[PDB]
């Protein structure tokens, strides 16, 4: 389903649909599993495209501003996407 670099809205148990890239592509009969880069938080973690969405095609239906630590750092950085930290 997904490219590496690809832009999109991670959802874990504890927080919302946060808004995040894929920075490794998976192999490839995968580790089933897409590695995330979160913004704003600059977190990291591996999921299922069960808990996939993809950015741009659900802007506006996740992309509501939300009073979390490093949520509306994350939206704004769309914007410069590829950070690093």
């Given at each position: 389903e997904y490219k590496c670099g690809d832009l999109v809205f991670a959802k874990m148990k504890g927080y919302?649909?946060?808004?995040?890239?894929?920075?490794?592509?998976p192999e490839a009969s995968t580790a089933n599993k897409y590695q995330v880069f979160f913004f704003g938080t600059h977190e990291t973690a591996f999921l299922?495209?069960?808990?996939?969405?993809?950015?741009?095609?659900?802007?506006?239906?996740?992309?509501?501003?939300?009073?979390?630590?490093?949520?509306?750092?994350?939206?704004?950085?769309?914007?410069?996407?590829?950070?690093?930290?």
């Open positions: 919302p649909h946060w808004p995040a890239r894929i920075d490794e592509m299922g495209p069960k808990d996939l969405f993809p950015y741009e095609e659900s802007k506006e239906k996740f992309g509501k501003p939300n009073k979390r630590k490093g949520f509306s750092e994350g939206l704004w950085e769309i914007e410069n996407n590829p950070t690093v930290k």
